[PDB]
Symmetry: C3
Subunit: 94 residues, 3 copies
């Protein structure tokens, strides 16, 4: 599993949601953050994705969140060492 995190313009959240839903990605977690540099509001999207699917997810988010203008933000991929499903206590394979 990989954690895909993106810091996006807030008005692109619905486009990102549509792209992820269309791909069948579950577990989208959203929070509001401040992009300092005093600040511009941003949305942080996070989703944990299988190793097999993460690059597709990165590309989908990138295309949906893009404007080509400054401030578009970045997508980060971090390795997840272990993921546990709380419902069943099961550790991941994918």
């Amino acid at each position: 599993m990989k954690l895909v995190m993106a810091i996006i313009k807030p008005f692109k959240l619905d486009e990102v949601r549509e792209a992820l839903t269309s791909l069948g990605i579950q577990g989208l977690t959203v929070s509001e953050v401040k992009g300092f540099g005093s600040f511009l509001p941003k949305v942080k999207v996070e989703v944990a994705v299988s190793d097999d699917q993460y690059e597709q997810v990165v590309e989908a988010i990138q295309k949906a969140a893009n404007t080509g203008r400054i401030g578009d933000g970045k997508i980060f991929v971090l390795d997840i060492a272990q993921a546990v499903r709380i419902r069943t206590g099961e550790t991941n394979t994918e």
Copy 2:
């Protein structure tokens, strides 16, 4: 050190707190996030734990946050490359 992150049902936060406190875990950091898919409120818990203790922490959170119903969420473990204590400027060994 490992970063343990869990996305839980908000009404399980106090159970998770009790479990972590009983284990002597410090540094619990909590935020409110939105589980989209428009959304259900969730709580994100994060704690940085020694390599020696992280699996116990994962298990404690899982048992405390479990209902067995859909939406229970996941726990993610990410490797921390370096942790610095701000109070003293000291880098971790554990």
Copy 3:
């Protein structure tokens, strides 16, 4: 790239901002979190930094956020496997 995350006392945010701005670091992302243990308000700062610069960033944050008293918090460095600039769709080298 590395993700540098710090959980700091809220009244040190402006000092941390000054230190990062002076170093020419961009992309500072800030959120408000709760340090439980019911809680004290904290600020979470996050910035993705090149491998070449991350230790300087860690040191700058540490010095700016320090009081020497309990509750100062920690800085965590996590490896980023891939970073994509949303504006251009470009993957990182640094």
